[PDB]
RNA sequence: GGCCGGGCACUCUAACGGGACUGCCCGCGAAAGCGGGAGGAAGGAGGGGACGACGUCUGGUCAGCAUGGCCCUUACGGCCUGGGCGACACACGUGCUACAAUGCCCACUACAAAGCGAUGCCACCCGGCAACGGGGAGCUAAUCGCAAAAAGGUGGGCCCAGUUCGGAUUGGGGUCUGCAACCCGACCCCAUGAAGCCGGAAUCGCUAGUAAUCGCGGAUCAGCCAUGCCGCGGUGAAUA
């Protein structure tokens, strides 16, 4: 994919800016999920829209998988 | 001096749009090699006849970029005279290089 | 949305990618001769109409 | 003198000597370099006797490849037969005096290939 | 059910273009997007005098709006004032040398796109549509013509069935290429809806 | 065949350059 | 030689019969061992087979070992599970090709049902 | 072919042996149009001819092209019939066009690995009896005389 | 490898012209026209195009657009951001690649045609296994680039094995575009190498430079899911 830049985002890192600053509980709603696996988030807060609601599930160190909508579905089953 | 590229779309005005320039030749002083028509290359475009639910044949039709060019070995300033006159192109763009 | 649209093509205070070829004489967002800024069917008239120079029924 | 096939254009100029036949800077046998179909263009020479009384400097350009070889067929025996009135006595007779408009036809008409129409069911 | 346009057929032959110039691919687009909004503000304004043509020439940073009519008067006006501001509206859009001209068609009963533009008003005027046709063609074939044909859309009223009104005299061939057959079209917005008219005037075979 | 990529015929048909069709 | 006996054939291609040794890694690793890529896989001395027999099974990973490593990138894939993680839990295209028509090679053969 | 009869194409004579019956053969050997490959195989096969039988790979081509010429056939045209197969006579023409065609598939139906070593390797068989070709023509021929009863309305 | 001071036979170019008309031949009877000679690059519209009567299906299309009517007018209009059109137990039409040894691969080696290039084509060296990148060329292009066409041709290796066949799938890297390729891009390298030994009932295409077959161009395009599409050429059948 990309190789120049952390191909991450910008406009909601400022909400993560304080991932090491204030006190750092949870809850954090994005929309542009294009963000790559934000690489400094332990037991944190997936909170990703997908048309529907924002999806919440854990985000641990191995979890450093791909992006964000990676763990945010958009569909239906069988 | 005398390589001059008579461009254009309109074609019957290039056998005449040049035959008239090559006669500033036989008036100014230049045993001029007449119009050399370097190859036409054409930008044709094919397009679906109907506005919905045709698809099989369409009608093509071309935009024949025509082209010619002129020459000699003799370039006096009375040449410059005629070339500022006798200009009869409806829409036949023409440039000059030395 | 049909008209409020054409002036999304003309404004582009948005990235290079958000841009395209809405026609002039009509708005068809599809099938657009680059060099006329137009449409398979708009064009195909002005031609028969002969309000486009040079173009005419081909063959070979 | 000259000949054409599939817009294969073959300039044929003939001079006497013996066994000399070269084209685009290759000897005609290293030009096709194995292609025994090819060895057949230089065969009006055989039509009435002219085995080796006429060598060949020809320059073919454009058009085919193996059909480029038939291009030297009426490039030869038509620039060649230029002299001798009594010489056409084997080119109209023996069928060797034609261009053959057998050329690839225009792909057209929403077909796949100017004939092969799409499938059907 | 086909009949491709009767001119596109004869567009580089027996009918010279309606827009004569040449432009370099890199710019041709703009020599059109500009080139029509003239035609798209002249047939608009000069409908009054009734124009059959809007031939447009150039070859530099200029213009050549040789607008044809068969009745100038309303084009030039008196002394020259409509035509004077018209050649300034034009350079209000095309910041160029808006060089205009005028014609009087030697016969209007021999311009199709007039004949059409005419009958299509008789339609907007709630008139005998068939009769309109029997006369329109009679107009043309009397003022010297080898053939002539008009064909109306196919309405007249109601809320339903729509037909087509067809009549003609002389001959109007079309698998004949050396044809020279002027064709015109015109709309006609009634309370009912739109109609059309195909104008077919056969001047002569070159 | 015109679908292996990793071949002469592979990249030729797809018309891509690669280790196996560098150029000429 | 990994875990396999390949006999009458080309060392060039023989070594490829191994999961994790392709036609490439057999010529580039043949440089390394410096053997002849055209000689049969039988004409190589016992004292010199051990070119390969100490080489490529040590240059990296392959059968068994590397075989096993491929599935670790998939147990990984139900971390949270990606869209890419799931589509083995449902046996479907993970590049994301059309799962309408075709997509057959990932989910068995046509299990046919009734219609309209 | 309802209007006229359609033209028989006169073949561009063999590019070595001069003989049209030798072009017609290499023709029915060319997959697609690589032609070069088609006449290699054939000429290759004449070389294989020389190896095994010191005859002229030309009469080896004849006592073969006429061995596998079916005398007659069953034109089962459908007039009235639920499978009426009135047999008749084979044309000089069809005799050859079939016989050629037969020899090439009969060659390709053999388990020898190099298409050259095949196409003469039974072009030899067909030549005094024998050969997948004459069989696939023997059958053919015995289909008539067996269906002789329907001679009555031959044509 | 005109690389040339010089030249317009040729080549191709690209304009305006000639040329076929059924032509003198006992076999058509007043006829028309059909034969089988001659010359011709050429014969019975010469290949083929564009062209498609009155009408027909109240066919298609109000989503290109036009347009009467009807209905919505802090919403049936407007913007944004994310999603979707890409879903998958399955059924079809069109296709692409094949199951191979007339074949598949690594070499070198020929031989086209139409077209396209100022956010181009990018010649040529550097880098890199390469995609590509750093650079930097001639470029308004018959005069430089796309470009190298592939079958072909040689010459070498595979020896009927699901294989040096087949390229699916998944793992891993890693490029260009692009604000951003999770959903969803194309490409590249490594490794995985699935179904598939010629396809039931059935069913399509073609008159010859056709079918088959081989690449190439172009449109649209930031890039691209093109195997599609219109083009163009290479080799080139069978049969009536
Ligand atoms: Mg776009
Ligand atoms: Mg030509
Ligand atoms: Mg050919
Ligand atoms: Mg072709
Ligand atoms: Mg009613
Ligand atoms: Mg109608
Ligand atoms: Mg009312
Ligand atoms: Mg392979
Ligand atoms: Mg993919
Ligand atoms: Mg999908
Ligand atoms: Mg895909
Ligand atoms: Mg026959
Ligand atoms: Mg008579
Ligand atoms: Mg007569
Ligand atoms: Mg004709
Ligand atoms: Mg869709
Ligand atoms: Mg396909
Ligand atoms: Mg196929
Ligand atoms: Mg070349
Ligand atoms: Mg640079
Ligand atoms: Mg893949
Ligand atoms: Mg960018
Ligand atoms: Mg036919
Ligand atoms: Mg292509
Ligand atoms: Mg392109
Ligand atoms: Zn349009």
């Amino acid at each position: 994919s990309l190789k120049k830049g952390v191909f991450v985002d910008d406009h909601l890192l400022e909400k993560v800016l304080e991932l090491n600053a204030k006190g750092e509980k949870r809850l954090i709603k994005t929309w542009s999920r294009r963000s790559t696996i934000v690489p400094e988030m332990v037991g944190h807060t997936i909170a990703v829209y997908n048309g529907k609601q924002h999806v919440p599930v854990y985000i641990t160190e191995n979890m450093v998988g791909h992006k964000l909508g990676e763990f945010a579905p958009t569909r239906t089953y069988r | 001096k005398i390589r001059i590229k008579l461009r254009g779309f309109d074609h019957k005005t290039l056998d005449a749009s040049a035959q008239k320039i090559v006669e500033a030749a036989r008036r100014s002083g230049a045993q001029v090699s007449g119009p050399i028509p370097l190859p036409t290359r054409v930008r044709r475009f094919t397009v679906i006849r109907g506005p919905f639910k045709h698809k099989d044949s369409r009608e093509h039709f071309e935009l024949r970029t025509h082209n010619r060019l002129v020459d000699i070995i003799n370039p006096n300033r009375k040449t410059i005279e005629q070339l500022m006159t006798l200009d009869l192109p409806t829409g036949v763009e023409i440039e000059i290089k030395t | 949305a049909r008209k409020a649209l054409i002036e999304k093509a003309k404004r582009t205070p948005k990235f290079k990618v958000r841009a395209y070829t809405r026609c002039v004489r009509c708005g068809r967002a599809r099938s657009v001769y680059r060099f006329f800024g137009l449409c398979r069917i708009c064009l195909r008239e002005l031609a028969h109409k002969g309000q486009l120079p040079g173009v005419r029924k081909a063959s070979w | 003198g000259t000949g054409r096939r599939k817009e294969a254009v073959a300039r044929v100029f003939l001079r006497p000597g013996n066994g000399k036949v070269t084209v685009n800077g290759q000897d005609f046998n290293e030009y096709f370099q194995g292609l025994v179909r090819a060895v057949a263009a230089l065969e009006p020479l055989r039509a009435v006797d002219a085995l080796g009384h006429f060598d060949a400097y020809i320059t073919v350009r454009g058009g085919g490849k193996s059909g480029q070889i038939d291009a030297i067929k009426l490039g030869i025996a038509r620039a060649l037969v230029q002299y001798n009135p009594d010489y056409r006595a084997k080119l109209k007779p023996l069928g060797f005096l034609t261009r053959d408009a057998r050329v690839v036809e225009r792909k057209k008409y929403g077909k796949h290939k100017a004939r092969r129409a799409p499938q059907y069911s | 059910g086909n009949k491709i346009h009767p001119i596109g057929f004869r567009l580089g032959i027996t009918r010279d273009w309606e827009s004569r110039w040449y432009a370099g691919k890199k710019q041709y687009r703009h020599l059109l997007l500009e080139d029509q909004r003239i035609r798209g503000l002249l047939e608009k304004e000069l409908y009054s005098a009734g124009l059959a043509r809007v031939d447009i020439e150039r070859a530099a940073d200029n213009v050549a709006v040789t607008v044809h009519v068969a009745k100038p008067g309303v084009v030039i006006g008196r002394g020259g004032e409509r035509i004077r501001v018209l050649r300034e509206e034009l350079a209000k859009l095309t910041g160029k040398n808006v060089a205009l001209n005028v014609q009087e068609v030697q016969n209007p009963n021999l311009s199709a796109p007039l004949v059409a533009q005419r009958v299509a008003e008789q339609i907007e005027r709630r008139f005998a549509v068939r009769r309109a046709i029997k006369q329109a063609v009679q107009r043309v074939m009397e003022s010297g013509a080898k053939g002539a044909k008009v064909i109306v859309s196919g309405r007249i009223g109601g809320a339903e069935q729509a037909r087509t009104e067809w009549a003609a005299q002389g001959r109007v061939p079309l698998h004949t290429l050396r044809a020279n057959i002027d064709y015109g079209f015109a709309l006609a917005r009634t309370t009912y809806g739109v109609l059309g008219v195909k104008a077919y005037i056969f001047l002569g075979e070159v | 065949g015109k679908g292996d990529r990793r071949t002469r015929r592979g990249k030729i048909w797809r018309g891509t350059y690669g280790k196996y069709r560098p150029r000429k | 030689a990994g875990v396999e006996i390949p006999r009458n054939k080309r060392v060039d291609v023989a070594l490829t019969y191994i999961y994790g040794i392709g036609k490439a890694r057999a010529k580039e690793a043949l440089e390394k061992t410096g053997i002849n890529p055209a000689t049969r896989v039988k004409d190589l001395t016992e004292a010199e087979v051990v070119r390969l027999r100490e080489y490529v099974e040590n240059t990296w990973k392959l059968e068994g070992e590397l075989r096993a490593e491929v599935a670790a990138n998939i147990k990984r894939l139900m971390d949270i599970g990606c869209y890419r993680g799931l589509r083995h839990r449902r046996g479907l295209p993970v590049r994301g090709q059309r799962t309408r028509t075709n997509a057959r090679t990932r989910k068995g053969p046509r299990k046919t049902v009734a219609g309209k | 072919a309802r209007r006229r009869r359609a033209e028989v194409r006169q073949l561009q004579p063999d590019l070595v042996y001069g003989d049209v019956l030798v072009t017609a053969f290499i023709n029915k050997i060319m997959r697609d149009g690589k032609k070069n490959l088609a006449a290699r195989i054939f000429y290759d096969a004449c070389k294989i001819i020389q190896e095994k039988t010191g005859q002229e790979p030309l009469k080896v081509f004849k006592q073969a092209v006429e061995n596998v010429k079916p005398r007659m056939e069953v034109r089962s045209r459908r007039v009235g019939g639920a499978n009426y197969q009135v047999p008749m006579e084979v044309s000089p023409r069809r005799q050859q066009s079939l016989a050629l065609r037969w020899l090439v598939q009969a060659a390709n139906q053999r388990p020898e690995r190099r298409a050259a070593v095949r196409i003469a390797h039974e072009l030899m068989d067909a030549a005094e009896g024998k050969g997948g070709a004459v069989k696939k023509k023997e059958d053919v021929e015995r289909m008539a005389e067996a269906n002789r009863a329907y001679a009555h309305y031959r044509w």
Side-chain angles (χ1 to χ4, degrees):
Chain A
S1 70
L2 271 205
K3 65 292 170 183
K4 327 153 158 187
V6 201
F7 47 109
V8 63
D9 208 49
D10 265 339
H11 66 50
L12 211 30
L13 261 43
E14 190 204 352
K15 224 49 192 169
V16 201
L17 196 167
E18 304 76 15
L19 191 272
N20 289 343
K22 227 304 170 187
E24 290 87 38
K25 206 149 59 187
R26 283 181 265 179
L27 245 180
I28 171 56
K29 282 72 51 181
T30 166
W31 265 265
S32 35
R33 68 174 88 196
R34 27 179 164 187
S35 41
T36 316
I37 37 176
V38 293
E40 232 165 339
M41 299 65 203
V42 51
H44 213 189
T45 307
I46 294 194
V48 190
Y49 196 73
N50 52 23
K52 301 180 171 80
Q53 28 191 293
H54 314 89
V55 304
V57 46
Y58 221 67
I59 166 174
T60 170
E61 92 155 340
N62 53 257
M63 202 276 199
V64 60
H66 295 66
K67 281 195 183 296
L68 281 203
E70 281 293 277
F71 322 129
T74 37
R75 252 101 199 171
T76 197
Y77 41 60
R78 54 270 211 211
Chain B
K1 293 141 147 40
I2 37 176
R3 208 228 177 200
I4 307 185
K5 269 162 64 80
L6 251 64
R7 299 301 239 174
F9 292 149
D10 215 326
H11 161 239
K12 281 73 201 171
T13 166
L14 272 202
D15 204 303
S17 210
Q19 170 54 233
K20 276 210 91 192
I21 283 303
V22 73
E23 284 186 29
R26 330 196 175 117
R27 283 212 300 177
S28 324
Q31 43 152 292
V32 156
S33 158
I36 179 182
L38 58 81
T40 61
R41 75 218 304 242
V42 163
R43 160 155 294 181
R44 102 191 92 94
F45 253 80
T46 82
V47 85
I48 285 191
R49 204 121 50 200
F52 188 80
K53 184 223 281 272
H54 180 184
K55 175 43 92 83
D56 305 79
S57 211
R58 315 175 220 291
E59 47 190 16
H60 333 96
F61 61 128
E62 300 190 295
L63 183 68
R64 307 225 289 184
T65 324
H66 279 289
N67 215 155
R68 316 212 202 291
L69 170 47
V70 84
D71 226 4
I72 187 43
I73 48 184
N74 314 116
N76 56 99
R77 306 310 163 245
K78 150 69 39 176
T79 67
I80 278 284
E81 175 269 299
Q82 274 114 347
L83 295 203
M84 233 86 69
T85 78
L86 212 83
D87 164 284
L88 271 45
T90 166
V92 186
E93 276 56 355
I94 169 59
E95 51 106 39
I96 38 62
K97 23 178 72 184
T98 324
Chain C
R2 174 271 212 101
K3 162 173 203 185
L5 284 192
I6 318 148
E7 41 261 60
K8 241 161 48 181
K10 312 314 155 98
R11 66 152 255 201
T12 319
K14 265 321 155 192
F15 333 99
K16 259 160 56 183
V17 285
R18 300 184 191 182
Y20 39 60
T21 37
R22 247 88 161 282
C23 168
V24 201
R25 186 207 231 192
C26 80
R28 194 178 215 112
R30 309 185 177 142
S31 210
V32 64
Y33 211 138
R34 246 181 301 266
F35 318 87
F36 301 171
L38 288 171
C39 285
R40 83 152 148 266
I41 296 311
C42 312
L43 153 58
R44 150 195 171 60
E45 193 40 272
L46 313 84
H48 295 117
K49 205 67 60 190
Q51 297 178 353
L52 291 213
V55 285
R56 52 186 293 257
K57 308 234 101 173
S59 68
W60 69 95
Chain D
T2 37
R4 297 150 189 134
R5 181 41 187 267
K6 305 202 101 303
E7 202 216 319
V9 202
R11 275 155 65 193
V12 169
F13 296 155
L14 318 97
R15 290 83 178 75
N18 232 326
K20 317 169 190 292
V21 279
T22 280
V23 196
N24 287 15
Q26 303 283 307
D27 199 326
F28 100 99
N29 282 125
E30 71 186 326
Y31 189 46
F32 77 67
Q33 199 190 55
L35 211 162
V36 200
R37 186 268 162 133
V39 303
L42 51 153
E43 219 181 344
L45 328 174
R46 311 184 179 263
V48 311
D49 212 44
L51 171 132
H53 332 311
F54 255 120
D55 286 320
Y57 167 77
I58 68 105
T59 280
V60 64
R61 33 191 50 251
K65 185 197 304 198
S66 303
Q68 200 176 75
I69 285 136
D70 263 39
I72 321 167
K73 196 66 170 184
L74 252 204
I76 297 187
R78 205 251 311 191
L80 152 74
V81 192
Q82 177 188 35
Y83 78 85
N84 199 305
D86 307 282
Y87 208 8
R88 295 252 298 199
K90 70 151 150 32
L91 267 67
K92 166 57 60 195
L94 324 173
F96 289 78
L97 243 195
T98 325
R99 205 291 211 171
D100 206 13
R102 273 234 300 297
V103 301
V104 72
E105 85 155 277
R106 166 227 201 189
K107 184 262 171 272
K108 38 174 159 280
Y109 259 117
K111 257 63 172 173
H112 270 179
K113 263 172 71 283
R115 290 294 147 85
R116 213 248 168 289
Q119 273 253 70
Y120 189 11
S121 198
Chain E
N2 41 12
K3 301 154 232 290
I4 64 96
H5 205 283
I7 280 162
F9 207 18
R10 48 189 61 93
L11 192 272
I13 167 175
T14 323
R15 183 94 61 254
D16 289 87
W17 273 246
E18 197 195 1
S19 211
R20 248 205 207 179
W21 33 276
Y22 157 55
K25 293 76 189 173
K26 291 301 184 287
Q27 181 172 346
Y28 181 9
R29 164 148 86 174
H30 288 277
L31 251 173
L32 263 42
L33 169 143
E34 164 185 305
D35 211 312
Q36 188 99 356
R37 75 193 57 243
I38 316 148
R39 297 179 163 113
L41 202 142
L42 293 214
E43 296 138 13
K44 168 199 207 146
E45 307 286 330
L46 206 78
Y47 183 79
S48 324
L51 72 184
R53 263 260 198 172
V54 297
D55 207 321
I56 290 204
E57 259 191 45
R58 74 231 320 151
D61 45 337
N62 50 321
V63 161
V65 176
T66 316
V67 153
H68 300 57
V69 195
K71 259 150 170 40
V74 169
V75 312
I76 306 174
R78 328 153 288 102
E81 281 148 20
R82 172 137 147 182
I83 181 166
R84 255 48 200 148
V85 285
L86 294 180
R87 301 169 180 189
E88 180 58 31
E89 309 273 6
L90 294 163
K92 172 182 165 59
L93 46 67
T94 291
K96 294 186 175 194
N97 182 320
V98 291
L100 182 155
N101 262 80
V102 175
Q103 259 297 344
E104 182 189 61
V105 191
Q106 269 59 25
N107 207 294
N109 304 339
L110 266 161
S111 191
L114 275 184
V115 159
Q117 271 190 348
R118 193 200 174 112
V119 153
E121 295 181 12
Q122 318 192 220
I123 277 172
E124 257 181 79
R125 289 303 142 254
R126 273 105 172 160
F127 273 145
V129 194
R130 173 121 284 262
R131 180 176 273 116
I133 283 308
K134 282 276 133 177
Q135 304 169 343
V137 160
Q138 213 39 234
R139 210 182 312 267
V140 169
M141 293 303 287
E142 194 91 34
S143 100
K146 294 193 68 223
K149 182 141 75 195
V150 201
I151 290 124
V152 197
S153 148
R155 237 201 166 192
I156 194 144
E160 275 163 355
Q161 254 314 290
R163 220 168 307 97
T164 280
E165 219 56 18
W166 178 107
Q169 236 192 303
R171 65 177 110 150
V172 200
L174 218 68
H175 190 78
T176 64
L177 251 172
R178 55 170 109 96
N180 170 33
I181 318 195
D182 191 13
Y183 162 88
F185 179 75
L187 279 203
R189 306 176 68 184
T190 89
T191 324
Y192 321 147
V194 279
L195 292 317
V197 279
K198 307 91 181 154
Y200 291 123
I201 308 205
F202 188 31
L203 324 166
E205 181 195 5
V206 317
Chain F
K2 323 160 175 80
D4 198 330
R5 316 193 171 195
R6 310 229 215 171
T7 62
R8 163 81 50 260
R9 205 62 21 61
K11 272 124 187 288
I12 285 185
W13 168 95
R14 176 101 83 232
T16 66
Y17 290 150
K19 161 172 165 179
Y20 312 78
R21 182 188 169 75
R23 194 241 280 201
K24 211 170 206 311
Chain G
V3 187
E4 164 217 324
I5 279 80
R7 266 161 213 266
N8 289 22
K9 63 198 90 173
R10 204 82 141 271
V11 282
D12 213 8
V13 201
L15 283 306
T16 323
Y17 272 158
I18 320 182
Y19 189 104
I21 289 80
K23 203 59 179 307
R25 292 194 191 196
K27 169 50 51 63
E28 193 232 38
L30 213 163
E31 299 178 17
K32 268 199 146 312
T33 52
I35 319 194
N36 186 7
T39 314
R40 285 295 94 158
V41 201
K42 48 196 305 189
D43 313 348
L44 51 153
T45 36
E46 268 209 88
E48 162 274 325
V49 168
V50 294
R51 283 294 123 67
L52 303 164
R53 195 256 262 174
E54 214 175 343
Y55 252 85
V56 52
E57 61 285 289
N58 294 307
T59 319
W60 49 37
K61 281 183 179 300
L62 39 71
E63 296 229 18
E65 202 175 17
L66 170 162
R67 282 192 45 84
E69 206 225 13
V70 196
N73 313 151
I74 308 205
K75 174 114 190 163
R76 168 131 162 156
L77 281 185
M78 82 296 188
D79 47 326
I80 321 94
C82 327
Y83 159 105
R84 234 181 50 80
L86 291 185
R87 294 165 89 57
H88 262 267
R89 285 65 189 151
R90 298 86 174 259
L92 292 172
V94 317
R95 317 283 132 110
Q97 315 85 287
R98 77 186 273 169
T99 66
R100 277 276 277 77
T101 167
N102 297 333
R104 275 298 129 190
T105 313
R106 274 214 52 84
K107 48 153 160 185
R110 283 72 149 73
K111 322 122 199 182
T112 296
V113 73
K116 264 202 31 153
Chain H
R2 172 45 201 161
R3 305 212 102 272
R4 259 87 169 186
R5 197 189 174 171
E7 288 291 17
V8 153
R9 286 130 157 276
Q10 218 53 50
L11 260 279
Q12 197 69 11
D14 181 284
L15 324 176
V16 167
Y17 301 59
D19 214 1
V20 282
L21 323 163
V22 201
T23 36
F25 199 100
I26 37 181
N27 273 346
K28 302 276 209 186
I29 313 184
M30 182 25 47
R31 98 153 202 283
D32 315 337
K34 334 185 80 74
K35 173 62 165 206
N36 297 130
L37 261 81
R40 283 180 207 287
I41 308 168
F42 171 62
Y43 291 137
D44 288 14
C46 319
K47 319 201 177 184
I48 293 288
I49 296 271
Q50 294 290 81
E51 219 182 315
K52 284 266 194 169
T53 166
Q55 284 176 112
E56 37 209 22
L58 181 104
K59 188 47 194 167
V60 201
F61 190 90
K62 267 44 147 206
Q63 211 195 35
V65 84
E66 312 130 10
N67 280 340
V68 198
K69 256 165 187 163
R71 323 280 110 79
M72 50 264 288
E73 262 275 91
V74 279
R75 283 341 271 171
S76 148
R77 74 311 161 260
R78 150 174 164 136
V79 47
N83 233 48
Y84 254 124
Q85 42 204 159
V86 280
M88 48 214 276
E89 271 135 349
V90 173
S91 67
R93 315 151 280 271
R94 217 183 135 82
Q95 253 163 280
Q96 145 178 266
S97 311
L98 287 135
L100 303 165
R101 187 190 320 184
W102 273 336
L103 274 276
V104 202
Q105 36 171 289
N108 291 284
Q109 274 175 336
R110 183 139 69 262
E112 283 133 11
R113 44 181 102 101
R114 229 194 97 203
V117 178
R118 267 214 308 286
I119 186 140
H121 197 295
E122 79 145 53
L123 212 163
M124 232 156 278
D125 285 304
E128 263 265 335
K130 197 179 255 164
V134 201
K135 176 82 207 102
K136 276 169 75 156
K137 161 222 161 222
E138 276 156 356
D139 254 19
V140 154
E141 247 186 278
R142 276 183 289 94
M143 296 291 195
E145 200 276 276
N147 292 97
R148 202 153 159 179
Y150 326 134
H152 79 123
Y153 224 120
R154 38 196 83 154
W155 153 228

